[PDB]
Amino acid sequence: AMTDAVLELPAATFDLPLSLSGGTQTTLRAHAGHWLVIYFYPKDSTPGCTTEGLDFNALLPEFDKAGAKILGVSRDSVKNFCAKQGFAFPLVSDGDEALCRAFDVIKEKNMYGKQVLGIERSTFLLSPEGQVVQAWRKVKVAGHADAVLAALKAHA
């Protein structure tokens, strides 16, 4: 079926702690009951974080009416302008990369000659019950938020 899930997640993924602004935590289980757009972004790209975030933020009202919430995910790294933007949806930190690994977004990247591990910009659409109905990996930001919104309505 064109509505079937494209990825299967370990059950424990739904209770992994994600750190919010203010310091409290949230989980995927807390988002059960409504559609959820979960997008992952790399920390090494502030401009990309800012633009992808503002795009989803501008469309938040339509996502809300379509029955979905949005969660932006990354991993706090010792090595901020995006976080200061003030998106109307939560940005969370996956401290030990547990959630990232569950979605398999940690990939080998070339950073100025040195091979490192990092987050491959990716997005996932989950149903009210947790089914991952659609995925986007190594995302092209141009038109992405619009495409995710379209996908949400197509599954509605």
UniProtKB/Swiss-Prot annotation:
- Active site location: C49
CDD domains linked to this entry: PRX_BCP (cd03017)
Provide the organism lineage as a comma list.
Bacteria, Pseudomonadati, Pseudomonadota, Gammaproteobacteria, Lysobacterales
Give the originating organism: Xanthomonas campestris pv. campestris (strain ATCC 33913 / DSM 3586 / NCPPB 528 / LMG 568 / P 25)
Q: By its UniProt entry, which InterPro entries does this protein fall under?
A: AhpC/TSA, Peroxiredoxin_BCP/PrxQ, Thioredoxin-like_sf, Thioredoxin_domain
Gene Ontology MF: a single term: thioredoxin peroxidase activity
Give the protein name, as stated in the record: Peroxiredoxin Bcp
Please, which domain of life does this record's source organism belong to?
Answer: Bacteria
GO cellular component labels:
cytoplasm
Q: What is the effect of changing C82S?
A: Abolishes catalytic activity
